[PDB]
Symmetry: D2
Subunit: 264 residues, 4 copies
């Protein structure tokens, strides 16, 4: 249900489909290996990061409500010890999130470069199929001439037979030239179709990966805003501590929504 | 040869087609159909092709041997022998054509059904994206008010406390609506990927059917007809036998 | 700036959108809608943008002048003056947002209607292509028989005469079915081209709506609120005025 | 209704849509000029060719039925005069058809080359948008650091003010770097969208043009088969003349179907 959970599930499906393709060039094998490693190694690290962010947020949510339950004045030394403890507990979550985002952007950026490289290759197949289509057109014309001469020499008497015995050999050669070019055009059309199908799956994988990266990045941004609220208690009035605790609690609840397993 | 390439392209699309999970019945229908086409029908097309080529090579040599010999009840002892030897191949070819068209036609119907499903999913999003936009705009307004109130110092605390309650409600609404839109978008994307593969499979299957039809037409013509005409007869038949070898070739 | 680019991209799509003829009602609906958006609504978005920027530049200078002066019934003679001067721009912005969403939502509904029409056209072809394949296969068989009979010399004349009659009937059937399939394929192609342009127009319109919403949210916040807090107040307000200039910029 | 009529009508619509595009590169202007010339000059020559093929076929259809109405023997000199007259009447139609096909293939092949050139350009925009996205990502990180230092120095006392007056200038510069890159990414996305739309219309024009070329080519092939039947009368038995006249009449009726204004 949640955006991380969906992106992960969709990426796992795209990856299985991406592995089903054979006979593709090196850039396609580059993506196949990359997505295999993303599904095997990085998506488990994203699930670990999600579990750790939620565990962290649940603990800090109760710590903040307990601070906001304080009546009378905030003892300024109790504040600092708390701010220190929270700053120490944010550090590792903020770090794991930044690391998770970096690993994700690295892998996804390599997919985009391999996709662009495959696209250049697809355009060079379009160029290739357009000379093969001309060669095919011209071998058809060549076969039209030969068959009109066969008409003509078959139209002559005994005088024709020598010329016909010759033309028979040219006709076979030109026919094999036409049948070969039809096979070559069919071949390149199939390669074009297969690569377009593959790029459709790698583009979909990268779109889902992008949704995952944007949500990891949103989680990091909220952790940074949370850090800023908490440090505005350390800068110290008991009503200011209450303002920054209240702001920090909105950010903690934002994390719980953004990193949530299930939507709602 | 086109026939050999069509088979090969059909095998690759079938592996890719089987990789997709979580699709509706109509997609499962195509997955089963293409599994059977690859397991049962393509080997029979390969057998048909071997028999046609073997038969064509034997009849080619025989027609040349006839065009070489130097008898009105000889041209009938032969024509009867050809129409005999050509009967089993004529059968395999008609069966293969009928089975191919039947399987291909079901893919076409399932594909249309999946297109109808996709348009309905797109209509479902349009109905939701409106509400999501609204919720995202309120959430934008609330994030801005949060930064402002926090900047007002203690004067902003009653206002921030009240906003914290509304923020929770709007964040839950945006989360639910995003999750719902994202789910349907994921389904549409998967089905479009699957439809690209099933359309490609069907295009290749069309080429195979066309080639199987061209072969069965040449064979039917050789199997249904009965004295210097013998020469013109053998010359016409031999032109046909040669197109048969080309249409059903392994090139 | 995004707002200026969205407008420009909307103008190009609208010229391309008006170039299409022979489309159903739902396409005509979009053609009229986008004509009015370009003629009436985008000039108003351009007017809104000018007024927002002019208002933001004046209030920015005023907020700096307040942060510079070295009176509890002065902070109210001002706040009342801002909420006054901001009221007309707050109105134009809400109207522009409402008119934009209304026009964009109708494009979305017409687009879905055209997608439903396209899937039905695709279902019509599937029903016909089967019959066309059949007719094309008979025609192939008849063209082959024609070349063969003609090769038999005078023995082939009765057979060619009979085939000439059937050939005419099959050629007329293939011609009718091809023409029908080709007509529907042409319609699908034109509508897909039109849908590419209307989707693009709507994507650009979405960016404009988002930017108009971000502006109206910043303005609403400046227009609804009321002593060293004055300093924090002016500092917060001034951060807002500056985002307003960025969101509504011409860059 | 007929395939020539439909292809022409569809090409006229695609051409109007192709002319509506502005701000595209030289290869797009190459196609705009080409399709303008196809609609202005070549489609009228295709309509003339169609009218001339049908006029020719109607006259030859009646000439062949009148020959087949001959009873008793074909006077071998009457045959030759007829064969000569028909060969003289085919020559100009076979020529106009070949010319029409050549002009069509020339124009269409230039569309395909300009399309491939536009596709190479679209892939170079994909490469360009992927460096702009990184530059944008990095200027966002740069703006995150600056705002965390502003947090920090705002956190210091009077000691902070000098450093803050400096950072204020860096923050403006980095902000203008981010706003500029967002505008540049938006700009290239719009260019990509517009070019894809244009290529969709030029691909459709070329598909319809291809249907026209295949039908012109089919008309030329039938005229060539008709020529071969008619010359097999010139090679001369009254029953052989009847065989080749009957074969020729099937080809004449094929032209009337293939070049037909209305389908059926
Ligand atoms: Na794997
Ligand atoms: Na978050
Ligand atoms: Na023009
Ligand atoms: Na024709």
């Amino acid at each position: 249900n949640g955006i991380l959970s969906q992106s992960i599930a969709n990426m796992q499906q795209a990856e299985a489909t991406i592995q089903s393709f054979s006979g593709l060039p090196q850039n396609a094998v580059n993506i196949q290996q990359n997505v295999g490693e993303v599904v095997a190694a990085l998506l488990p690290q994203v699930q670990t990061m999600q579990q750790q962010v939620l565990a962290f947020a649940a603990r800090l949510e109760l710590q903040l409500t307990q601070q906001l339950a304080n009546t009378g004045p905030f003892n300024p030394e109790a504040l600092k010890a708390f701010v220190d403890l929270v700053q120490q507990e944010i550090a590792p979550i903020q770090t794991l999130t930044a690391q998770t985002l970096t690993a994700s952007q690295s892998a996804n950026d390599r997919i985009t470069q391999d996709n662009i490289a495959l696209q250049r290759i697809g355009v060079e197949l379009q160029a290739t199929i357009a000379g093969l289509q001309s060669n095919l057109d011209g071998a058809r014309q060549e076969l039209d001439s030969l068959n009109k001469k066969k008409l003509y020499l078959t139209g002559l008497g005994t005088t024709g037979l020598p010329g016909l015995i010759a033309l028979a050999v040219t006709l076979t050669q030109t026919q094999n030239k036409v049948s070969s070019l039809e096979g070559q055009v069919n071949q390149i059309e199939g390669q074009i179709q297969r690569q377009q199908g593959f790029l459709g799956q790698t583009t979909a994988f990268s779109q889902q990966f992008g949704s995952l990266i944007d949500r990891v990045s949103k989680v990091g941004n909220t952790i940074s805003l949370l850090g800023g609220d908490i440090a505005n208690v350390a800068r110290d009035d008991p009503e200011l501590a209450r303002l920054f605790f209240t702001a920090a609690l909105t950010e903690v609840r934002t994390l719980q929504v953004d990193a949530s397993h299930h939507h709602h």
